[PDB]
Each structure stands twice: as structure tokens, then as C-alpha cells.
């Protein structure tokens, strides 16, 4: 049994990371301007 509040907070951060990875890619990848 894994406490729900932990499941969300871990999956929560997990979402902020990957989406934040996307925002970084806006200044580096092909989606850049440099």
C-alpha cells in the first residue's frame, strides 16, 4: 500500500520535470532561433 499523497506528489514533480524539459527545448532545440 503506497499512500496516495505520495503517488500524486511524485507524479506531480514528474510532470513538472518533463514539461520543464520542453520549455528548455524552446531555447536550444530546433525550436530555437539561433
Amino acid at each position: 500500500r503506497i499512500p496516495l499523497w505520495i503517488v500524486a506528489t511524485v507524479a506531480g514533480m514528474g510532470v513538472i520535470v518533463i514539461v520543464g524539459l520542453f520549455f528548455y527545448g524552446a531555447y536550444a532545440g530546433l525550436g530555437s532561433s539561433l
Partner: peptide
């Protein structure tokens, strides 16, 4: 170069100071 090491610790710090409280059960 990679200060993501910082964020990581200070980030899990938040839920830690209440997780330890779920362990020591009290005052939530």
C-alpha cells in the same frame, strides 16, 4: 554546469519535512 543537483534536494526537502511527520505520526 548542472545545478539540477541543487533543486532536486531542496525540492524533495519540502515533502520530506511532512513525510517524516507521517512516520512520527503527529500534528498534521
Amino acid at each position: 554546469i548542472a545545478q539540477l543537483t541543487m533543486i532536486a534536494m531542496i525540492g524533495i526537502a519540502g515533502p520530506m519535512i511532512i513525510f517524516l511527520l507521517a512516520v512520527r505520526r503527529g500534528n498534521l
